[PDB]
Scaffold this active site. Structure first.
Site, PDB file in Angstrom:
ATOM      1  N   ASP A 146      36.519  44.517  44.594  1.00 51.59           N
ATOM      2  CA  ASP A 146      37.959  44.616  44.833  1.00 51.59           C
ATOM      3  C   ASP A 146      38.324  45.783  45.750  1.00 51.59           C
ATOM      4  OD1 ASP A 146      40.700  44.242  44.672  1.00 51.59           O
ATOM      5  OD2 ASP A 146      40.855  44.560  42.519  1.00 51.59           O
TER       6      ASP A 146
ATOM      7  N   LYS B  45      51.603  53.018  39.813  1.00 56.94           N
ATOM      8  CA  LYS B  45      50.458  52.601  39.018  1.00 56.94           C
ATOM      9  C   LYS B  45      49.491  53.768  38.795  1.00 56.94           C
ATOM     10  CE  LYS B  45      47.350  48.627  38.634  1.00 56.94           C
ATOM     11  NZ  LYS B  45      47.001  47.384  39.365  1.00 56.94           N
TER      12      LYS B  45
ATOM     13  N   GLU C  50      42.130  42.693  35.447  1.00 54.94           N
ATOM     14  CA  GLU C  50      42.152  42.131  36.791  1.00 54.94           C
ATOM     15  C   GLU C  50      40.885  41.362  37.158  1.00 54.94           C
ATOM     16  OE1 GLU C  50      43.284  45.673  38.880  1.00 54.94           O
ATOM     17  OE2 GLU C  50      45.388  45.390  38.424  1.00 54.94           O
TER      18      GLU C  50
ATOM     19  N   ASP D  16      50.327  39.922  39.315  1.00 53.68           N
ATOM     20  CA  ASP D  16      49.386  40.946  39.712  1.00 53.68           C
ATOM     21  C   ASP D  16      50.282  42.132  40.093  1.00 53.68           C
ATOM     22  OD1 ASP D  16      47.360  42.543  40.923  1.00 53.68           O
ATOM     23  OD2 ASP D  16      47.464  41.410  42.777  1.00 53.68           O
TER      24      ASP D  16
HETATM   25 MG   LIG Z   1      45.131  43.652  44.839  1.00 54.90          MG
END
Ligand SMILES: [Mg+2]
Ligand SMILES: Nc1ncnc2c1ncn2[C@@H]1O[C@H](COP(=O)(O)OP(=O)(O)O)[C@@H](O)[C@H]1O
Length: 383
Positions: A198, A70, A174, A9
């Site tokens: 999330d 990112k 994800e 991840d």
């Molecule tokens: Mg995370």
């Protein structure tokens, strides 16, 4: 030969790595004993620090400590997003033939790296941690990426893997990995709708997946690109700055190292507040020679972020609406991201879903890595 495939991840603020072995997934803890390591890279006169070592010195090295890669990866310099974010990063981003690039001073010399190069540094740390645990070399890997990442951002992530010496078997989304973690990919001869909520360090994503006969389909997505745990920490900071100013008559806003040292304390207290109702804030020599000793209640912490926590539901409603579903039509609710450990947010979401039970037995910050590891084992042919 052997070399277990790993699941990674690659997070905005934290990354996590786990392996599937003997029917079970094991999330690998780092040298410091943490199950997730900061997505931070720092450059000094003598070394290149990555992960925990990097984040633990940010108050001293603001200009040479890189993070949020990112947010840059796969984008252009002339990208409105880049232009906006750029305004608040303590490090420099330059334009190299249209491509954004980070500029840092390493060993006296001025050096610049592409976002992909920064990420590969983090990936090297994960691979490193995995190898240290497995006691074997790790080559093959499955890395995760937000469902909205386009071809460029996805390739840039594959590239970051290649640079780090990782054979990326597949780049999966994800939300899809989080579902796989809970086994919501098993065929049940029925169409199932899953809601991935999330909430991590600085990004808020909500996606509605539809899994039928084994294939995933992203129905809708929503959220806020600048809402995360860091925002909750800041509210606490402002709170304590005003507290200090009142009790000592001295505003500490000006002192950037004091502020950041306070913020670090708030992030830790915040975590304690997810299990306890009161937390201590012990900071020696916060400003000048004044020690800052106080405490905060979960009640006050919830008070400080009321509007923030509450606003979390807006993106959820929109998600439902775009997907063309009612609250009742969603079968499973999976919690992802370190911030979903907060009691109030769990309450608020459950109340919204009229009592429906939340999927949360797997630590939300380890869920994506967990699912990636499972998928890695499948792709490698060992599960
Ligand atoms: Mg995370
Ligand atoms: N116990 C907790 N209570 C609240 N927030 C937590 C807790 N544990 C971790 N977090 C927060 O989760 C965020 C990390 O989320 P994570 O998914 O690991 O990061 P990201 O996806 O942003 O890379 C940070 O804001 C951290 O403070």
């Amino acid at each position: 030969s052997k070399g277990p495939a790993v699941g990674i991840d690659l997070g905005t603020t934290y990354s996590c790595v786990g392996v599937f072995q003997h029917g079970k997934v094991e999330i690998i803890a780092n040298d410091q004993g943490n199950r997730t390591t900061p997505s931070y890279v720092a450059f000094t006169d003598t070394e290149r620090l990555i992960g925990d070592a990097a984040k633990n010195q940010v108050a001293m090295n603001p200009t040479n400590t890189v993070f949020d890669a990112k947010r840059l990866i796969g984008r252009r310099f002339d990208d409105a997003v880049v232009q906006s974010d750029m305004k608040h990063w303590p490090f420099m981003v330059v334009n190299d033939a249209g491509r954004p690039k980070v500029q840092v001073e390493y060993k006296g010399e001025t050096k610049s790296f592409y976002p992909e190069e920064v990420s590969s540094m983090v990936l090297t740390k994960m691979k490193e941690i995995a190898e240290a645990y497995l006691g074997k070399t790790v080559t093959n890997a499955v890395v995760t990426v937000p469902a909205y990442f386009n071809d460029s951002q996805r390739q840039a992530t594959k590239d970051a893997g290649t640079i780090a010496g990782l054979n990326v078997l597949r780049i999966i989304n994800e939300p899809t990995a989080a579902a796989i973690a809970y086994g919501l990919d098993k065929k049940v001869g029925a169409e199932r709708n899953v809601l991935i909520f999330d909430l991590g360090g600085g990004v808020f994503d909500v996606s509605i997946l539809t899994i039928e006969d084994g294939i995933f389909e992203v129905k809708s997505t929503a959220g806020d690109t600048h809402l995360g745990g860091e925002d909750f920490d800041n509210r606490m900071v402002n709170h304590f700055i005003a507290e200090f100013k009142r009790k000592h008559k001295k505003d500490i806003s000006e002192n950037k190292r004091a502020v950041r040292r306070l913020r670090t304390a708030c992030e830790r207290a915040k975590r304690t507040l997810s299990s306890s109702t009161q937390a201590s804030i012990e900071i020696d020599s916060l400003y000048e020679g004044i020690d800052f000793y106080t405490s905060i209640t979960r009640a006050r912490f919830e008070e400080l972020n009321a509007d923030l926590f509450r606003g979390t539901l807006d993106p959820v409603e929109k998600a439902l609406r775009d997907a063309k579903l009612d609250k009742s039509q969603i079968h499973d609710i999976v919690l992802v991201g370190g911030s979903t450990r907060i009691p109030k947010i769990q309450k608020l979401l459950q109340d919204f879903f009229n009592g429906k039970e939340l999927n949360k037995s797997i630590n939300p910050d380890e869920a994506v890595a967990y699912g990636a590891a499972v998928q890695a084992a499948i792709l490698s042919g060992d599960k």
